[PDB]
């Protein structure tokens, strides 16, 4: 518990990476026409958060 923090027509996109023990998150939100596959076109992802965790990561799970 040595660190803690608090703050279909559409698609939410994200990127997660860990470097130097800093864990970094980026995002984009957009409307979409079709659900079957990712959109055949370009849009950029922008940063949200930088976390000083130092912890090691090799697996993950999504929460429904």
């Amino acid at each position: 518990c040595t660190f803690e923090y608090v703050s279909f027509k559409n698609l939410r996109e994200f990127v997660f990476k860990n470097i130097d023990g800093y864990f970094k998150i980026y995002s984009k939100h957009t409307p979409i026409n079709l659900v079957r596959d990712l959109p055949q076109g370009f849009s950029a992802l922008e940063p949200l958060v930088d976390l000083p965790i130092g912890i090691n990561i090799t697996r993950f799970q999504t929460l429904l």
Partner: peptide, 22 residues
């Protein structure tokens, strides 16, 4: 005292066998 225990860049662990400074 003997409480000050010891065994990547900014990598850390607390799982177990540790030494400690006399």
């Amino acid at each position: 005292n003997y409480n000050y225990l010891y065994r990547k860049p900014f990598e850390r662990d607390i799982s177990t066998p540790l030494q400690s400074y006399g």
